[PDB]
Amino acid sequence: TDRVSVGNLRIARVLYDFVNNEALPGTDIDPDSFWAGVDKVVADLTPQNQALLNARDELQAQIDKWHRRRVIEPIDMDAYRQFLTEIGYLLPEPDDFTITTSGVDAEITTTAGPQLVVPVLNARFALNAANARWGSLYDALYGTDVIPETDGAEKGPTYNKVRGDKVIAYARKFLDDSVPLSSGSFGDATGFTVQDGQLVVALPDKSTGLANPGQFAGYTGAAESPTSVLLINHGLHIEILIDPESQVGTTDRAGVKDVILESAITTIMDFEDSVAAVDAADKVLGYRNWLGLNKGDLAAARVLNRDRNYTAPGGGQFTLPGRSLMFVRNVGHLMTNDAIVDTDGSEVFEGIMDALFTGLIAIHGLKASDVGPLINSRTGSIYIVKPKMHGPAEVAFTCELFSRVEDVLGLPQNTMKIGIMDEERRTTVNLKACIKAAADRVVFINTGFLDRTGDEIHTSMEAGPMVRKGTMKSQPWILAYEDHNVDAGLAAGFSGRAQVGKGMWTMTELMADMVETKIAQPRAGASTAWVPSPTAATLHALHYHQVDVAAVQQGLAGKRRATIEQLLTIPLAKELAWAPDEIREEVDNNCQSILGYVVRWVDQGVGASKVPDIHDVALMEDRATLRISSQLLANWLRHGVITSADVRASLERMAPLVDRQNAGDVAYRPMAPNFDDSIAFLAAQELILSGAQQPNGYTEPILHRRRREFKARAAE
Ligand SMILES: O=C(O)/C(O)=C/C(=O)c1ccccc1F
Ligand SMILES: [Mg+2]
Ligand SMILES: [Mg+2]
Ligand SMILES: [Mg+2]
């Protein structure tokens, strides 16, 4: 073997070397103490981890049997609730309480704004995401469909001034609505000066100041003719860049070159559903990127931005963070990984490893980067998103795991904070108890609605055929789940203490649609919501300038807008819901999305890909969207909506279409015509045909097996 013996563990040499040579130096942790701690924490917590997974299986078996024993009309909700209560699925609601989490940075406790999620194994994307704390509004408007490409306003190879003027006018309207002038419009501004600590905007006839002078936050250059003006609205910064010599500035009435928005306030560096990491080599690539981010010296085929310097309105130099405040999303409780095996050859639980290793690495972001000031949390916290938890015992386990890791690392208790994903049904219906179990560590709750939809289908798999995938988004259960999450957070005192977050916008090119509709999330009292790209971060920032999330949350206090009956409304399809063409469209759409995602996962180790759907809309796919598609098809197959020939025909029909979409790259192995020779095609087939048998419908068991299979065959 190429393994290292520490107690009962056998550690892959690449991981042992990375920890000793790269992660531990600078933390003052004795390497011998660290590895003995790994051994002891793994030994002590693995039994409870396994017991929690077995409890999931026990509950699901009882629910399967309950549906198979019934024949009655729709579900008697009264009997169903009583059943869930007796089996320990629906637990009592605890008494009211307020969270006690302390030592948390303002970006989380106070600032409302976008949250970006990026795969940590892609160093270039991760750097762009950390740098996405500031983003050009002109770039985001000019380069997307927010400004429609109508006659004369099209994008070309060179600058289209008619389009640029549309961008400029959009941004002037944004300034008027966000930081209004005492009189007149930013559209008519001819210049900016700082006078007696106040901003003066020259108009063609008069001069004017801000309606609220307190929104003037600073400037660069001389007050007499500043190079930029810094504004603030709803806690988010806006920077007007002034340069008449620039390509855009020469066309502008005031010499304005750009408007920069504070955009991705926080970023989640993802080890979970957006990356493919099936062995120690893969995990070390991710850990090393996470280390470079926390030490400040990650650099790609591109570097991290330093902080931004300003002058205060009344004089004085100050700084603003140039980087998004970073979370790391660990994997959840299910999977093991052979990066470490025990003496019997059993793989070690991956979530326990992630806590030890990402927590160790995060110490570097609490201290000075040599490449200047410390990178991440000035208040002394480590921010870990913990996904796919099922109910409050699983949250309490994560808390104990973090407590034990803090001890190994020499950190104060409760340094390691938890972003709780509300993305499994047994968490949703016990959410108050889940928050209480983490009441001194929780820094957000977030509706991971895609995983939640997969869990909805799997939990009630035996109840009957579910509605189509696109219908799910508007079903009663999910609207109740979204309001219930906000209600629980606000009642636990999250306002001013923790984030209340909502889910990802997946249509990466439909930015006009995103700007039109994602405003719903801050209007519902979410202090953050997930975006797929720095560009979408800048555009979603617009929504927090329009919506006073703090005011909305205060207006929601005390309201209880979702009942348990609503939360438990299973999304079963009605009698004769679909024509044959609608059933075929659903199968074809789901098969193409499964194939387009899985082929890059298995053959190239890419955990997130833009995959065009049956309507040619580019969707960002990750494991959760796969969980939905495979579970829905497994459910339709289980209840006779479609046949096994329908499934095979759809996969074979969509496969060469996916081959075409990928013809452009060197590492692509086509699936057609020899389908059963493609490990990726077989993986996609297995996710559907074995989907009903996977634990809680999770995709990782199959995906990890098939990726490792592919790696092994490519190695011989
Ligand atoms: O809704 C969930 O379950 C969830 O966690 C969201 C995501 O993982 C995600 C989905 C698409 C693209 C990137 C992403 F990070
Ligand atoms: Mg999820
Ligand atoms: Mg306001
Ligand atoms: Mg099962």
XYZ file of C-alpha atoms and ligand atoms in Angstrom:
734
model
C 0.000 0.000 0.000
C 0.816 3.677 -0.314
C -0.785 4.382 3.071
C 0.347 5.690 6.450
C -0.566 3.884 9.676
C -1.934 6.092 12.459
C -3.659 4.027 15.131
C -6.497 2.140 13.462
C -6.371 4.281 10.316
C -4.494 3.837 7.032
C -4.161 7.275 5.416
C -3.564 7.737 1.688
C -0.013 9.028 1.361
C -1.007 12.007 -0.836
C -3.356 13.243 1.897
C -0.856 12.575 4.714
C 1.811 14.563 2.839
C -0.527 17.434 1.985
C -1.615 17.829 5.605
C 1.914 17.702 7.034
C 3.643 19.835 4.413
C 0.945 22.353 3.454
C -1.971 22.543 5.893
C -0.360 22.123 9.316
C 2.650 24.514 9.050
C 1.624 27.864 10.490
C -1.170 26.569 12.742
C 1.036 25.690 15.764
C -0.651 22.267 15.878
C 1.684 19.368 16.598
C 1.420 16.922 13.655
C 1.525 13.945 16.022
C -1.278 15.482 18.098
C -3.344 16.186 14.995
C -3.202 12.671 13.552
C -3.866 11.085 16.943
C -6.899 13.375 17.139
C -8.087 12.206 13.710
C -7.790 8.588 14.882
C -9.671 9.265 18.116
C -12.451 11.376 16.564
C -13.027 8.817 13.793
C -13.082 5.967 16.325
C -15.409 7.803 18.734
C -18.013 9.219 16.290
C -18.252 6.597 13.529
C -20.761 4.395 15.469
C -23.172 7.324 15.976
C -22.777 8.341 12.329
C -23.757 4.811 11.282
C -26.659 4.733 13.753
C -28.083 7.928 12.270
C -27.909 6.444 8.758
C -29.653 3.284 9.991
C -32.431 5.404 11.558
C -33.071 6.982 8.135
C -33.481 3.500 6.641
C -35.813 2.361 9.448
C -38.096 5.386 9.065
C -38.236 5.110 5.265
C -39.112 1.409 5.455
C -42.053 2.173 7.753
C -43.246 4.940 5.404
C -42.913 2.658 2.353
C -44.974 0.012 4.158
C -47.600 2.538 5.286
C -48.298 3.582 1.689
C -48.264 0.005 0.362
C -50.789 -1.038 3.034
C -53.255 1.717 2.075
C -55.805 1.897 -0.755
C -57.923 4.834 0.433
C -58.862 7.786 -1.891
C -56.317 10.592 -1.110
C -54.197 10.459 2.017
C -56.134 10.904 5.248
C -53.885 13.686 6.544
C -55.039 13.098 10.119
C -53.952 9.446 10.096
C -50.717 10.254 8.246
C -49.651 12.840 10.848
C -50.440 10.431 13.683
C -48.349 7.793 11.926
C -45.360 10.117 11.436
C -45.604 11.088 15.112
C -45.692 7.510 16.417
C -42.640 6.402 14.414
C -40.515 9.334 15.609
C -40.472 11.196 12.275
C -42.545 14.186 13.412
C -41.089 15.296 16.737
C -42.631 17.700 19.275
C -42.060 21.409 18.713
C -39.721 22.866 21.371
C -40.502 25.989 23.336
C -39.596 29.324 21.769
C -35.985 30.445 22.026
C -33.413 32.854 20.616
C -30.108 31.737 19.094
C -26.928 32.660 20.987
C -24.335 32.420 18.176
C -21.618 35.019 18.734
C -18.384 36.059 17.058
C -19.935 36.319 13.581
C -18.900 38.807 10.879
C -21.196 41.646 9.755
C -21.559 40.146 6.245
C -23.633 37.377 7.878
C -25.305 39.015 10.877
C -26.309 42.264 9.192
C -25.712 42.675 5.460
C -28.422 41.400 3.121
C -27.250 40.420 -0.338
C -26.303 37.679 -2.803
C -24.483 34.458 -1.872
C -22.369 32.806 -4.593
C -21.697 29.030 -4.727
C -18.666 27.696 -6.625
C -16.896 24.305 -7.022
C -13.763 24.375 -4.867
C -11.905 22.000 -7.214
C -11.863 24.655 -9.983
C -9.233 27.144 -8.827
C -10.046 29.655 -11.559
C -13.769 29.728 -10.748
C -13.066 29.890 -7.006
C -10.769 32.901 -7.411
C -13.365 34.690 -9.569
C -15.981 33.959 -6.911
C -13.927 35.299 -3.999
C -13.168 38.372 -6.134
C -16.906 38.729 -6.977
C -17.519 40.868 -3.858
C -17.308 43.755 -6.347
C -18.589 43.571 -9.898
C -19.148 45.878 -12.852
C -22.831 46.664 -13.424
C -22.076 47.877 -16.976
C -20.445 44.545 -17.835
C -23.347 42.604 -16.318
C -25.934 44.658 -18.235
C -24.069 44.858 -21.555
C -23.063 41.201 -21.676
C -26.424 39.585 -20.780
C -30.020 39.765 -22.002
C -31.040 42.224 -19.247
C -30.668 44.814 -22.021
C -32.581 43.028 -24.815
C -30.801 42.551 -28.142
C -33.461 44.363 -30.138
C -32.896 45.895 -33.572
C -29.893 48.199 -33.273
C -28.994 47.089 -29.721
C -27.353 43.788 -30.639
C -24.044 42.554 -29.321
C -21.368 42.493 -31.978
C -17.624 41.882 -32.095
C -17.037 45.525 -31.113
C -18.757 48.044 -28.858
C -22.327 48.958 -29.873
C -22.859 52.520 -28.616
C -26.665 52.254 -28.894
C -26.517 49.283 -26.528
C -23.981 51.015 -24.279
C -26.285 54.017 -24.006
C -29.081 51.634 -22.940
C -26.732 50.258 -20.257
C -25.889 53.767 -19.055
C -29.569 54.761 -18.838
C -30.479 51.601 -16.921
C -27.756 52.348 -14.379
C -28.778 56.013 -14.019
C -32.315 54.845 -13.230
C -30.877 52.449 -10.631
C -28.984 55.322 -8.971
C -32.086 57.523 -8.951
C -34.053 54.745 -7.277
C -31.322 53.711 -4.805
C -29.595 56.971 -3.775
C -32.003 59.740 -4.812
C -30.887 63.308 -5.376
C -32.460 66.156 -3.421
C -33.763 67.391 -6.769
C -33.259 66.241 -10.319
C -31.941 63.024 -11.779
C -28.596 61.320 -12.085
C -29.469 61.161 -15.796
C -28.717 64.890 -16.011
C -25.557 64.940 -13.868
C -22.509 66.676 -15.328
C -19.997 66.107 -12.517
C -19.289 65.243 -8.902
C -17.421 67.109 -6.167
C -16.916 66.601 -2.437
C -17.507 69.836 -0.512
C -17.594 70.276 3.284
C -17.723 66.504 3.639
C -20.799 66.280 1.409
C -21.417 65.100 -2.136
C -22.420 67.748 -4.681
C -23.813 66.631 -8.029
C -23.594 69.213 -10.799
C -26.767 69.522 -12.854
C -26.981 71.524 -16.105
C -28.875 74.344 -14.339
C -28.228 73.902 -10.596
C -26.235 71.789 -8.185
C -27.739 69.340 -5.728
C -26.874 66.963 -2.922
C -28.251 63.606 -1.865
C -31.760 63.444 -0.444
C -30.131 61.436 2.358
C -26.560 62.782 2.726
C -25.761 59.746 4.906
C -25.665 57.573 1.775
C -22.425 59.288 0.740
C -19.787 56.808 1.920
C -16.526 58.110 0.465
C -14.486 58.824 -2.631
C -11.107 58.352 -4.282
C -8.815 61.039 -5.636
C -9.090 64.719 -4.814
C -12.344 65.993 -3.358
C -12.040 68.709 -6.029
C -12.369 66.204 -8.899
C -12.715 62.669 -7.524
C -11.875 59.586 -9.529
C -14.813 57.750 -7.945
C -17.721 58.335 -5.565
C -18.786 55.665 -3.053
C -22.446 55.394 -2.003
C -24.288 53.057 0.369
C -27.884 51.833 0.304
C -29.446 49.110 2.474
C -25.943 48.341 3.751
C -24.558 47.598 0.246
C -21.980 49.779 -1.490
C -22.212 51.397 -4.943
C -19.179 52.974 -6.624
C -19.431 55.446 -9.508
C -16.175 55.452 -11.488
C -15.295 58.784 -13.119
C -12.976 58.875 -16.130
C -13.737 61.042 -19.186
C -10.758 59.574 -21.026
C -12.226 56.068 -21.023
C -14.020 54.427 -23.928
C -17.354 54.669 -22.098
C -16.560 57.819 -20.107
C -16.021 59.909 -23.237
C -19.614 59.225 -24.295
C -21.074 60.023 -20.852
C -22.583 63.351 -19.791
C -20.670 63.264 -16.488
C -17.602 61.282 -17.564
C -18.848 58.172 -15.755
C -16.928 55.059 -16.798
C -18.811 52.364 -14.854
C -20.955 51.651 -11.821
C -19.466 48.987 -9.512
C -21.796 47.099 -7.170
C -20.952 45.273 -3.984
C -22.251 41.924 -5.176
C -21.284 38.511 -3.762
C -21.165 39.479 -0.090
C -20.399 35.857 0.830
C -19.265 32.844 -1.194
C -19.657 29.136 -0.468
C -16.589 27.156 -1.589
C -18.189 23.799 -2.347
C -16.860 20.290 -1.573
C -20.321 18.773 -2.037
C -22.860 18.727 -4.860
C -20.957 20.847 -7.416
C -17.706 18.808 -7.360
C -16.687 15.248 -8.229
C -14.168 13.923 -5.723
C -14.039 10.172 -5.250
C -10.591 9.465 -3.764
C -7.688 11.063 -1.905
C -6.198 12.598 -5.062
C -9.462 14.440 -5.723
C -9.984 15.534 -2.112
C -6.417 16.881 -1.909
C -6.934 18.988 -5.045
C -9.952 20.564 -3.325
C -8.281 20.915 0.071
C -5.273 22.595 -1.545
C -7.491 25.163 -3.272
C -9.311 25.795 0.030
C -5.867 26.256 1.639
C -4.688 28.712 -1.023
C -7.882 30.705 -0.545
C -7.411 30.928 3.206
C -3.685 31.716 2.960
C -4.437 34.320 0.265
C -1.928 32.946 -2.242
C -4.057 30.821 -4.568
C -3.131 31.726 -8.151
C -4.415 30.119 -11.348
C -3.563 29.800 -15.063
C -5.056 35.255 -11.801
C -4.916 36.158 -8.091
C -7.095 37.274 -5.194
C -7.918 40.967 -4.949
C -6.626 43.070 -2.091
C -8.939 45.368 -0.145
C -10.197 48.629 -1.640
C -8.973 52.006 -0.373
C -11.218 55.048 0.097
C -11.299 58.458 1.727
C -14.101 59.058 4.199
C -16.502 61.955 3.491
C -14.921 63.987 6.300
C -11.356 62.874 5.617
C -9.528 59.763 6.726
C -8.356 56.695 4.837
C -10.338 53.505 5.232
C -10.553 50.109 3.639
C -13.335 47.826 2.428
C -12.887 44.066 1.906
C -12.007 43.263 -1.665
C -13.133 39.663 -1.269
C -16.298 37.795 -0.474
C -16.487 36.314 3.022
C -15.939 32.595 2.499
C -17.939 29.615 3.751
C -16.963 26.027 2.933
C -19.674 23.420 2.236
C -18.568 20.054 3.631
C -20.197 16.816 2.499
C -23.053 15.461 4.626
C -23.349 12.345 6.770
C -23.859 9.636 4.115
C -20.722 8.877 2.143
C -17.431 7.235 2.980
C -14.221 7.811 1.035
C -11.177 5.594 0.736
C -8.812 8.539 1.336
C -8.655 6.843 4.748
C -9.504 3.216 5.495
C -9.331 1.368 8.763
C -7.375 -1.806 9.450
C -10.273 -3.968 8.235
C -10.305 -2.010 4.945
C -13.485 -0.063 5.757
C -13.655 3.433 4.278
C -13.918 6.351 6.712
C -16.928 8.687 6.786
C -16.237 11.635 4.494
C -18.122 14.272 6.508
C -15.977 13.554 9.565
C -12.844 13.938 7.415
C -14.126 17.174 5.877
C -14.705 18.662 9.340
C -11.157 17.791 10.430
C -9.423 18.913 7.235
C -11.436 21.956 6.109
C -11.502 23.101 9.751
C -7.723 22.731 10.046
C -7.208 24.585 6.753
C -9.623 27.371 7.782
C -7.289 28.370 10.638
C -5.169 30.092 7.981
C -8.012 32.421 7.098
C -8.065 33.640 10.712
C -4.526 35.004 10.486
C -2.379 37.320 8.411
C -1.779 36.287 4.840
C 1.813 36.847 3.908
C 0.359 37.626 0.450
C -1.060 41.638 4.227
C -4.114 41.436 6.483
C -5.922 38.216 7.363
C -8.100 36.834 4.602
C -11.452 35.851 6.060
C -13.211 36.190 9.449
C -11.963 39.098 11.562
C -14.326 38.019 14.367
C -12.738 34.581 14.733
C -15.281 32.198 13.171
C -14.999 29.314 10.695
C -18.119 29.019 8.533
C -19.131 25.501 7.444
C -22.272 24.692 5.451
C -23.561 21.256 6.433
C -25.887 19.756 3.796
C -28.399 16.886 3.641
C -29.143 16.571 7.366
C -32.348 14.727 8.378
C -33.770 16.126 11.610
C -32.412 17.379 14.938
C -30.370 14.353 16.105
C -28.347 14.722 12.916
C -27.788 18.424 13.659
C -26.725 17.609 17.215
C -24.261 15.069 15.808
C -22.725 17.738 13.543
C -22.423 20.017 16.594
C -20.646 17.312 18.581
C -18.374 16.539 15.617
C -17.433 20.226 15.414
C -16.872 20.370 19.193
C -14.514 17.386 18.981
C -12.651 18.882 15.999
C -12.208 22.189 17.817
C -10.550 20.228 20.637
C -8.176 18.489 18.207
C -7.313 21.833 16.599
C -6.866 23.783 19.837
C -9.618 26.161 18.862
C -12.144 27.752 21.225
C -15.426 25.908 21.456
C -18.014 27.173 18.929
C -15.398 28.599 16.560
C -16.825 26.322 13.846
C -20.216 27.768 12.842
C -22.875 25.870 10.875
C -24.901 26.949 7.876
C -27.870 24.571 8.085
C -29.327 23.456 4.756
C -33.079 22.917 5.066
C -33.147 20.466 2.163
C -34.602 17.213 3.567
C -38.200 16.652 4.637
C -37.426 15.416 8.171
C -35.504 18.657 8.738
C -38.302 20.823 7.290
C -41.010 19.400 9.578
C -38.689 19.576 12.624
C -36.973 22.830 11.687
C -37.385 24.655 15.014
C -35.813 21.686 16.833
C -32.999 21.575 14.262
C -32.184 25.262 14.899
C -32.323 24.717 18.685
C -29.877 21.813 18.455
C -27.381 24.258 16.883
C -28.485 27.367 18.768
C -24.933 28.491 19.628
C -23.355 27.599 16.250
C -25.931 28.377 13.555
C -25.162 31.210 11.133
C -27.842 30.495 8.569
C -30.696 28.362 7.419
C -31.218 27.960 3.676
C -33.985 26.333 1.601
C -32.017 23.996 -0.641
C -35.158 23.456 -2.699
C -33.634 21.105 -5.281
C -32.448 18.480 -2.784
C -35.687 19.079 -0.889
C -37.631 18.163 -4.018
C -35.607 14.959 -4.465
C -36.347 14.015 -0.850
C -40.041 14.824 -1.347
C -40.230 12.322 -4.227
C -38.213 9.593 -2.528
C -39.996 9.788 0.835
C -43.404 9.288 -0.797
C -42.134 7.068 -3.632
C -44.686 4.340 -2.812
C -47.647 6.753 -2.486
C -48.180 7.137 -6.231
C -47.077 8.971 -9.369
C -45.745 12.491 -8.742
C -46.385 15.633 -10.767
C -43.950 16.627 -13.505
C -40.614 18.119 -12.510
C -41.513 21.683 -13.536
C -44.842 21.505 -11.693
C -42.972 20.759 -8.441
C -41.816 24.329 -8.180
C -45.341 25.581 -7.577
C -46.760 22.728 -5.486
C -48.338 23.537 -2.102
C -45.689 21.598 -0.138
C -42.816 23.717 -1.463
C -44.494 27.100 -1.009
C -45.281 26.129 2.587
C -41.698 24.897 3.067
C -40.322 28.269 1.872
C -42.512 30.359 4.226
C -42.047 27.925 7.134
C -38.267 28.282 6.840
C -38.417 32.102 7.042
C -40.936 31.907 9.909
C -38.719 29.561 11.933
C -35.612 31.687 11.373
C -37.260 34.969 12.341
C -38.909 33.400 15.417
C -35.492 32.129 16.562
C -34.153 35.710 16.402
C -32.223 35.430 13.121
C -32.803 39.107 12.241
C -29.519 40.820 13.010
C -27.842 37.521 14.038
C -27.947 34.986 11.193
C -28.820 34.639 7.528
C -32.186 33.457 6.259
C -31.426 32.179 2.794
C -33.138 30.834 -0.316
C -32.102 28.768 -3.279
C -30.186 28.803 -6.544
C -31.128 30.380 -9.875
C -30.109 27.699 -12.388
C -30.813 29.361 -15.780
C -27.370 30.853 -16.176
C -28.131 32.784 -19.377
C -31.688 33.972 -18.556
C -30.605 37.078 -16.672
C -33.530 39.256 -17.753
C -35.791 36.602 -16.249
C -33.644 36.418 -13.108
C -33.798 40.191 -12.586
C -37.560 40.092 -13.163
C -38.447 37.225 -10.837
C -35.723 36.513 -8.221
C -36.745 39.719 -6.407
C -39.366 37.384 -4.877
C -36.758 36.011 -2.472
C -35.770 39.244 -0.634
C -39.464 40.243 -0.795
C -40.178 37.069 1.194
C -37.696 38.176 3.861
C -34.589 36.242 2.781
C -31.427 38.130 3.700
C -29.532 36.124 1.080
C -30.105 33.834 -1.883
C -27.919 31.737 -4.126
C -26.524 32.802 -7.505
C -24.484 30.742 -10.012
C -21.910 33.282 -11.250
C -20.247 36.612 -10.420
C -22.387 38.200 -13.146
C -25.582 36.903 -11.557
C -24.314 38.112 -8.166
C -24.040 41.683 -9.507
C -27.508 41.544 -11.085
C -29.151 39.980 -8.020
C -27.570 42.755 -5.923
C -30.039 45.092 -7.672
C -32.865 43.315 -5.812
C -31.483 44.190 -2.362
C -31.346 47.865 -3.321
C -35.046 47.736 -4.207
C -36.192 45.626 -1.238
C -35.517 46.645 2.383
C -35.006 43.106 3.679
C -34.570 44.334 7.272
C -37.951 46.082 7.066
C -39.587 43.021 5.464
C -38.311 40.737 8.227
C -39.596 43.070 10.941
C -42.973 43.030 9.193
C -42.992 39.215 9.219
C -42.282 38.851 12.951
C -44.654 36.559 14.821
C -46.592 35.403 11.762
C -47.055 31.691 11.171
C -47.941 31.193 7.520
C -47.538 27.427 6.967
C -49.335 24.576 8.696
C -47.962 21.086 9.199
C -50.752 19.809 6.914
C -49.466 22.064 4.123
C -45.854 20.946 4.642
C -47.025 17.320 4.446
C -49.068 17.718 1.228
C -47.495 15.030 -0.998
C -47.229 16.207 -4.701
C -49.204 13.309 -6.174
C -50.520 13.716 -9.713
C -54.267 13.727 -10.281
C -56.420 11.375 -12.339
C -55.504 11.401 -16.061
C -53.111 14.311 -15.652
C -51.131 13.863 -18.886
C -51.438 13.276 -22.608
C -48.969 10.898 -24.302
C -46.946 13.787 -25.745
C -46.575 15.402 -22.320
C -45.329 12.118 -20.810
C -42.789 11.749 -23.620
C -41.566 15.344 -23.215
C -41.011 14.769 -19.493
C -39.046 11.557 -20.051
C -36.940 13.084 -22.837
C -36.223 16.223 -20.816
C -35.208 14.275 -17.711
C -33.074 11.784 -19.661
C -31.179 14.543 -21.486
C -30.467 16.432 -18.266
C -29.319 13.217 -16.557
C -27.092 12.214 -19.477
C -25.616 15.670 -20.050
C -24.671 15.954 -16.389
C -23.500 12.390 -15.715
C -21.269 12.024 -18.798
C -19.048 14.912 -17.671
C -19.183 13.663 -14.056
C -18.111 10.095 -14.730
C -15.733 10.571 -17.671
C -14.103 13.887 -16.717
C -14.726 14.395 -12.996
C -16.726 17.604 -13.484
C -19.295 18.097 -10.717
C -21.245 20.972 -12.265
C -22.002 21.603 -15.952
C -24.242 23.812 -18.046
C -26.528 21.346 -19.822
C -29.154 22.612 -22.296
C -32.565 21.111 -21.606
C -35.149 19.951 -24.173
C -36.042 23.628 -24.774
C -32.349 24.580 -25.240
C -32.263 26.556 -21.975
C -28.803 26.332 -20.415
C -29.200 24.960 -16.876
C -26.475 24.633 -14.242
C -26.675 20.971 -13.256
C -25.317 19.492 -10.048
C -26.119 16.419 -7.979
C -29.382 17.849 -6.601
C -30.916 18.474 -10.027
C -29.812 14.926 -10.896
C -31.490 13.639 -7.726
C -34.783 15.163 -8.888
C -34.656 13.873 -12.476
C -33.627 10.315 -11.615
C -36.090 10.084 -8.724
C -38.990 11.388 -10.840
C -38.301 8.853 -13.589
C -37.852 6.095 -10.993
C -41.248 7.108 -9.567
C -42.969 7.155 -12.977
C -41.487 3.712 -13.724
C -42.559 2.439 -10.288
C -46.201 3.360 -10.874
C -46.662 2.419 -14.516
C -46.682 5.892 -16.046
C -43.884 4.744 -18.393
C -42.316 1.414 -19.339
C -38.728 0.255 -19.186
C -38.661 0.440 -22.997
C -39.689 4.119 -22.779
C -36.713 4.807 -20.490
C -34.223 2.926 -22.655
C -35.496 4.565 -25.857
C -35.251 8.042 -24.341
C -31.713 7.500 -23.051
C -30.649 6.156 -26.445
C -32.407 9.041 -28.236
C -30.888 11.808 -26.108
C -27.381 10.311 -25.845
C -26.079 11.273 -29.334
C -27.602 14.717 -28.804
C -25.401 15.054 -25.716
C -22.467 13.651 -27.724
C -23.016 16.505 -30.190
C -23.134 19.171 -27.466
C -19.711 17.929 -26.307
C -18.004 17.287 -29.681
C -15.862 20.304 -29.033
C -13.513 18.784 -26.428
C -10.491 16.527 -26.171
C -11.406 14.408 -23.214
C -14.958 13.513 -24.360
C -15.760 9.866 -25.128
C -19.050 9.618 -27.107
C -21.745 7.420 -25.571
C -23.440 6.473 -28.871
C -23.517 4.089 -30.693
C -22.010 1.574 -28.240
C -24.059 2.597 -25.216
C -23.300 -0.430 -23.069
C -19.537 0.170 -23.559
C -19.822 3.640 -21.935
C -19.419 3.677 -18.152
C -21.146 7.079 -18.171
C -24.172 5.832 -20.124
C -24.471 2.834 -17.785
C -24.205 5.156 -14.777
C -27.098 7.255 -16.104
C -29.175 4.129 -16.711
C -28.399 2.814 -13.224
C -29.407 6.088 -11.554
C -32.895 5.602 -13.028
C -33.374 1.836 -12.844
C -31.878 1.541 -9.337
C -33.087 4.981 -8.209
C -35.933 3.737 -6.038
C -33.394 1.559 -4.168
C -30.870 4.290 -3.349
C -30.858 5.557 0.265
C -33.153 8.599 0.354
C -32.681 8.729 -3.418
C -29.076 9.926 -3.133
C -26.977 9.861 -6.316
C -23.497 9.672 -4.762
C -23.293 5.864 -4.228
C -23.739 5.177 -7.947
C -21.803 8.222 -9.159
C -18.797 7.522 -6.932
C -18.718 3.856 -7.921
C -18.887 4.629 -11.652
C -16.322 7.440 -11.555
C -13.874 5.169 -9.718
C -14.640 2.434 -12.254
C -13.825 4.846 -15.094
C -10.589 5.970 -13.418
C -9.531 2.348 -12.947
C -10.161 1.418 -16.591
C -8.353 4.538 -17.787
C -5.430 3.410 -15.584
C -4.871 -0.024 -17.186
O -31.147 23.196 -3.706
C -30.211 22.456 -3.256
O -30.260 21.301 -2.832
C -28.780 22.997 -3.241
O -27.994 22.712 -2.340
C -28.292 23.834 -4.414
C -27.185 23.524 -5.109
O -26.265 22.609 -4.607
C -26.867 23.951 -6.522
C -27.755 23.723 -7.582
C -27.422 24.108 -8.891
C -26.193 24.710 -9.170
C -25.284 24.942 -8.139
C -25.623 24.557 -6.820
F -24.753 24.782 -5.870
Mg -28.501 20.620 -1.789
Mg -34.700 52.027 1.287
Mg -35.157 2.078 0.195
